Amino acid sequence: KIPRGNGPYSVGCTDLMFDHTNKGTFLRLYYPSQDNDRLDTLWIPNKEYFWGLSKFLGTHWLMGNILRLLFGSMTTPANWNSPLRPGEKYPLVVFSHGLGAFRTLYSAIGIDLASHGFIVAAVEHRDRSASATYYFKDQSAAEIGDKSWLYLRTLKQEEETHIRNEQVRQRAKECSQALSLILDIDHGKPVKNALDLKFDMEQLKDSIDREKIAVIGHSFGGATVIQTLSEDQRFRCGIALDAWMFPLGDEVYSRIPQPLFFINSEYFQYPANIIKMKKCYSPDKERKMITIRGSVHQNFADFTFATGKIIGHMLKLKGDIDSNVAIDLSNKASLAFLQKHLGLHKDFDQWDCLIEGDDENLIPGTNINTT
Ligand SMILES: CN1C(=O)NC(=O)C1(C)C
Ligand SMILES: [Cl-]
DSSP: OOOOOSSSSOEEEEEEEESSSTTSEEEEEEEEBSOSOSOEEESSOOHHHHHHHHHHHTOOHHHHHHHHHHHTTOEEEEEETOOBOOSOOEEEEEEEOOTTOOTTTTHHHHHHHHHTTOEEEEEOOOSSOSSEEEEOSSHHHHHTTOOEEEEOOOOOGGGHHHHHHHHHHHHHHHHHHHHHHHHHHHTTOOOOOSSOOSOOGGGGTTOEEEEEEEEEEETHHHHHHHHHHHHOTTOOEEEEESOOOTTSOTTGGGOOOSOEEEEEETTTOOHHHHHHHHHTOOTTSOEEEEEETTOOGGGGSGGGTSSOHHHHHHTTSSOSSOHHHHHHHHHHHHHHHHHHHHTOOSSGGGGHHHHTTOSTTEEESOSOOOO
């Protein structure tokens, strides 16, 4: 089981695609809901995502069919298409997924934020970094629901530098476009969802706290955080969850005026990557870094909850730390940071000490020596 949110609000979930093209926005929205009797949200909603996971693993296509049998009926605790909780302006997080992931795989984070009164737009990237994604060739294809699938691109060593940088830049543009879409829906613009779903987007009119915007993301998504901040000053702060820094161009490092929080796993990080994080540091800039003891790269993603403790540890989905323990630390330290740099009037400052890594399961800064 993916955990329920720790906050006071019930959580809804829906999907939005606008426009219907490979250049439009695709996101999964998590939001405070008025109702708690809706069916739970299906975690991985299409067979092609399992085919794509199979390619990311470097296994045969039919392993996809096996992952689908294991995981294809699994839900996540958000009320599917529930009405939005009325009568409150909510801050907004745009969330960026890792390499091989897609929009639905960070629901433990998305639900937890939504239960505390955030609207969360988990983007699906069309840069071929997702295991799989889809869109429609034209208006006719959208109407009849004829999906076109786009699968993970494998790179040669020669393509690594250049293409990862092309992708992080597309990802940042995708974060900015998703923000503009939600802000336009907030400011009442009629948008016909390319997905025929029983959630009226009109509910979202006047529901966004328009200056209370943050960008969060994991791994490739954590580089997307940094690129997005350097390019779009509508985002007021960012949180990079175990950022993979390789995609960034040399130019971005000196160009991030916004507060930025690095939340790291113990076992992922390495000197080349830490040195790049430290290049984001300047005396005028607000920077924080914590490391979760006993944690692995995948502790930030939902697959840390999808298997048993022992198989989990073998597959590197789980660390020595308990997964609910680890994600609670990451989500609570995130909430305190967002409260600080978005100027929220909530009780999230109860977790201020976690930003400083002052907890038995936290390391202040990094365990990585860079000498
Ligand atoms: C770059 N990556 C990412 O974004 N997620 C992952 O698991 C790896 C490390 C492949
Ligand atoms: Cl790891």
